[PDB]
Amino acid sequence: GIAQQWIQSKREDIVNQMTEACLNQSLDALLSRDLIMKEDYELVSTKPTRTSKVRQLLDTTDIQGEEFAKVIVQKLKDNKQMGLQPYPEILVVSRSPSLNLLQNKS
């Protein structure tokens, strides 16, 4: 995909730039929008370290696809942290290109 692929390529850079406050705001918005049940919310919030909480959030991202990942990317743009400026096509671009063979490396 796109937002889930961006996460599955720069997960540790996202986890370094974002904080438990960004993660908590994402989880709170997801719970307010009923994208996460309390049963999964506690499994994503019982980890002993903030780094591992986001690692569990990123597993739930792959179950949902291009919606649960898109709000994490939107939360980063709303929090204007500048470390992630090469953002993906999360319906936020001024004019989206043809999105055909854009090319990729890691």
XYZ file of N, CA and C in Angstrom:
318
model
N 0.831 -1.227 0.000
C 0.000 0.000 0.000
C 0.854 1.261 0.000
N 0.395 2.320 0.677
C 0.998 3.669 0.671
C 1.345 4.136 2.094
N 0.361 4.425 2.951
C 0.600 4.879 4.324
C 1.160 3.741 5.193
N 0.606 2.532 5.049
C 1.160 1.318 5.663
C 2.563 0.966 5.123
N 2.877 1.267 3.853
C 4.219 1.050 3.281
C 5.243 2.048 3.832
N 4.869 3.327 3.939
C 5.683 4.387 4.545
C 6.066 4.002 5.982
N 5.081 3.580 6.788
C 5.304 3.002 8.122
C 6.221 1.764 8.074
N 5.989 0.801 7.177
C 6.806 -0.421 7.019
C 8.175 -0.189 6.332
N 8.626 1.067 6.226
C 9.934 1.466 5.682
C 10.707 2.412 6.616
N 10.008 3.283 7.366
C 10.611 4.263 8.296
C 10.000 4.250 9.709
N 9.420 3.115 10.124
C 8.910 2.820 11.485
C 9.772 3.384 12.614
N 11.077 3.113 12.616
C 11.970 3.568 13.690
C 12.234 5.085 13.636
N 12.224 5.696 12.448
C 12.325 7.152 12.283
C 11.051 7.855 12.775
N 9.874 7.304 12.458
C 8.581 7.746 13.000
C 8.579 7.628 14.526
N 8.960 6.476 15.082
C 9.040 6.234 16.536
C 10.066 7.135 17.243
N 11.138 7.543 16.560
C 12.117 8.510 17.065
C 11.580 9.959 17.052
N 10.915 10.374 15.967
C 10.393 11.738 15.807
C 9.091 11.971 16.590
N 8.098 11.086 16.458
C 6.885 11.089 17.283
C 7.197 10.675 18.732
N 6.274 10.945 19.652
C 6.418 10.631 21.084
C 5.189 9.890 21.602
N 5.218 9.449 22.863
C 4.042 8.860 23.514
C 2.828 9.798 23.470
N 3.018 11.123 23.494
C 1.931 12.089 23.315
C 1.280 12.005 21.917
N 2.075 11.873 20.847
C 1.576 11.700 19.474
C 0.832 10.363 19.299
N 1.422 9.279 19.809
C 0.844 7.932 19.897
C -0.478 7.921 20.686
N -0.512 8.553 21.859
C -1.692 8.667 22.716
C -2.807 9.472 22.033
N -2.478 10.597 21.390
C -3.416 11.364 20.564
C -3.963 10.557 19.379
N -3.113 9.786 18.693
C -3.547 8.883 17.623
C -4.524 7.826 18.154
N -4.168 7.121 19.235
C -5.028 6.138 19.907
C -6.354 6.731 20.407
N -6.329 7.923 21.000
C -7.516 8.640 21.470
C -8.443 9.039 20.310
N -7.893 9.558 19.205
C -8.650 9.849 17.987
C -9.241 8.571 17.356
N -8.452 7.494 17.268
C -8.884 6.175 16.793
C -10.022 5.595 17.648
N -9.953 5.721 18.977
C -11.002 5.274 19.902
C -12.268 6.145 19.796
N -12.129 7.474 19.715
C -13.241 8.407 19.444
C -13.943 8.145 18.104
N -13.207 7.649 17.100
C -13.703 7.304 15.754
C -14.023 5.805 15.589
N -14.011 5.049 16.691
C -14.299 3.607 16.793
C -13.480 2.695 15.842
N -12.282 3.134 15.430
C -11.327 2.334 14.648
C -10.538 1.315 15.498
N -10.555 1.438 16.832
C -9.920 0.502 17.775
C -10.871 0.183 18.944
N -11.128 -1.109 19.186
C -11.849 -1.583 20.380
C -10.960 -1.511 21.630
N -11.565 -1.360 22.818
C -10.857 -1.335 24.116
C -9.952 -2.562 24.338
N -10.375 -3.732 23.859
C -9.603 -4.983 23.914
C -8.230 -4.870 23.217
N -8.188 -4.255 22.029
C -6.945 -3.981 21.297
C -6.221 -2.748 21.858
N -6.956 -1.710 22.273
C -6.403 -0.496 22.883
C -5.530 -0.811 24.105
N -5.975 -1.701 25.001
C -5.156 -2.149 26.135
C -3.940 -2.982 25.704
N -4.050 -3.888 24.723
C -2.880 -4.606 24.185
C -1.852 -3.665 23.521
N -2.306 -2.562 22.919
C -1.467 -1.488 22.352
C -0.990 -0.481 23.424
N -1.423 -0.613 24.686
C -1.119 0.324 25.790
C -0.649 -0.356 27.095
N -0.323 -1.653 27.038
C 0.216 -2.453 28.162
C 1.736 -2.682 28.063
N 2.341 -2.392 26.899
C 3.795 -2.471 26.665
C 4.585 -1.626 27.691
N 5.747 -2.105 28.184
C 6.542 -1.411 29.205
C 7.312 -0.189 28.675
N 7.399 -0.022 27.352
C 8.136 1.056 26.675
C 7.307 1.678 25.550
N 7.458 2.998 25.379
C 6.710 3.811 24.404
C 6.995 3.390 22.959
N 8.246 3.028 22.682
C 8.712 2.458 21.407
C 7.926 1.199 21.021
N 7.729 0.283 21.972
C 6.958 -0.950 21.781
C 5.443 -0.724 21.687
N 4.870 0.300 22.346
C 3.462 0.696 22.116
C 3.208 1.035 20.644
N 4.056 1.874 20.036
C 3.937 2.207 18.601
C 4.144 0.964 17.731
N 5.066 0.065 18.094
C 5.250 -1.220 17.392
C 3.959 -2.056 17.344
N 3.181 -2.068 18.431
C 1.865 -2.719 18.485
C 0.779 -1.951 17.697
N 0.772 -0.609 17.743
C -0.095 0.250 16.911
C 0.092 -0.054 15.411
N 1.349 -0.210 14.987
C 1.756 -0.534 13.619
C 1.301 -1.932 13.152
N 1.163 -2.914 14.049
C 0.513 -4.192 13.717
C -0.984 -4.003 13.413
N -1.718 -3.246 14.238
C -3.139 -2.929 13.988
C -3.336 -2.108 12.704
N -2.375 -1.246 12.353
C -2.327 -0.542 11.058
C -2.430 -1.494 9.863
N -1.705 -2.616 9.869
C -1.708 -3.573 8.755
C -3.031 -4.358 8.639
N -3.737 -4.564 9.761
C -5.068 -5.196 9.797
C -6.116 -4.300 9.109
N -6.059 -2.983 9.341
C -7.029 -2.014 8.810
C -6.669 -1.459 7.419
N -5.379 -1.311 7.101
C -4.902 -0.771 5.825
C -4.745 0.757 5.820
N -5.127 1.369 4.700
C -4.967 2.793 4.363
C -6.000 3.727 5.052
N -6.288 3.520 6.339
C -7.149 4.399 7.166
C -6.516 4.632 8.545
N -6.198 3.539 9.242
C -5.521 3.532 10.540
C -4.079 4.052 10.426
N -3.377 3.699 9.341
C -2.089 4.298 9.003
C -2.232 5.780 8.616
N -3.231 6.136 7.789
C -3.439 7.525 7.338
C -3.611 8.511 8.493
N -4.334 8.164 9.565
C -4.463 9.067 10.729
C -3.159 9.242 11.521
N -2.255 8.251 11.566
C -0.906 8.421 12.157
C -0.105 9.459 11.355
N -0.132 9.354 10.023
C 0.537 10.302 9.115
C -0.091 11.705 9.207
N -1.425 11.803 9.263
C -2.142 13.064 9.502
C -1.803 13.682 10.866
N -1.696 12.880 11.938
C -1.249 13.339 13.264
C 0.156 13.934 13.221
N 1.089 13.320 12.492
C 2.433 13.872 12.290
C 2.418 15.215 11.542
N 1.640 15.338 10.455
C 1.451 16.621 9.751
C 0.788 17.697 10.614
N -0.200 17.336 11.430
C -0.856 18.240 12.382
C 0.094 18.712 13.504
N 1.027 17.851 13.929
C 2.034 18.138 14.959
C 3.306 18.834 14.403
N 3.390 19.087 13.085
C 4.459 19.826 12.368
C 5.874 19.659 12.955
N 6.382 18.424 12.946
C 7.683 18.080 13.546
C 8.880 18.176 12.577
N 8.631 18.415 11.281
C 9.599 18.596 10.174
C 10.553 17.420 9.866
N 10.758 16.468 10.779
C 11.609 15.287 10.570
C 11.114 14.312 9.488
N 9.828 14.383 9.113
C 9.162 13.460 8.182
C 8.621 14.162 6.910
N 9.085 15.383 6.590
C 8.622 16.197 5.443
C 8.332 15.464 4.107
N 9.091 14.437 3.660
C 8.688 13.549 2.557
C 7.519 12.607 2.941
N 6.370 13.194 3.281
C 5.106 12.503 3.547
C 4.541 11.794 2.289
N 3.752 10.711 2.450
C 3.073 10.018 1.356
C 1.798 10.751 0.886
N 1.179 10.254 -0.187
C -0.047 10.770 -0.829
C -1.342 10.495 -0.018
N -1.333 10.806 1.282
C -2.450 10.653 2.240
C -3.586 11.686 2.054
N -4.021 11.904 0.806
C -5.062 12.869 0.401
C -4.821 14.305 0.927
N -3.545 14.706 0.992
C -3.078 15.996 1.547
C -2.257 16.829 0.544
N -1.855 16.224 -0.579
C -1.115 16.873 -1.675
C -1.988 17.884 -2.436
N -1.384 18.980 -2.906
C -2.078 20.045 -3.657
C -2.602 19.580 -5.027
N -1.882 18.649 -5.670
C -2.226 17.982 -6.941
C -1.505 16.631 -6.987
N -2.219 15.535 -6.728
C -1.640 14.183 -6.796
C -1.209 13.840 -8.235
N 0.010 13.319 -8.476
C 0.443 12.876 -9.805
C -0.292 11.593 -10.247
N 0.060 11.060 -11.421
C -0.480 9.794 -11.959
C -0.234 8.555 -11.073
N 0.651 8.656 -10.067
C 1.064 7.591 -9.138
C 1.373 6.253 -9.846
N 2.172 6.330 -10.913
C 2.555 5.198 -11.757
C 4.087 5.131 -11.865
N 4.660 4.010 -11.409
C 6.103 3.747 -11.321
C 6.923 4.895 -10.683
N 6.435 5.441 -9.558
C 7.098 6.515 -8.789
C 8.519 6.138 -8.295
N 8.814 4.831 -8.224
C 10.078 4.195 -7.812
C 10.320 4.258 -6.289
N 11.079 3.289 -5.767
C 11.214 3.020 -4.332
C 12.599 2.420 -4.002
N 13.173 2.772 -2.844
C 14.395 2.159 -2.281
C 14.414 2.265 -0.748
N 15.204 1.410 -0.089
C 15.425 1.395 1.372
C 16.769 0.752 1.736
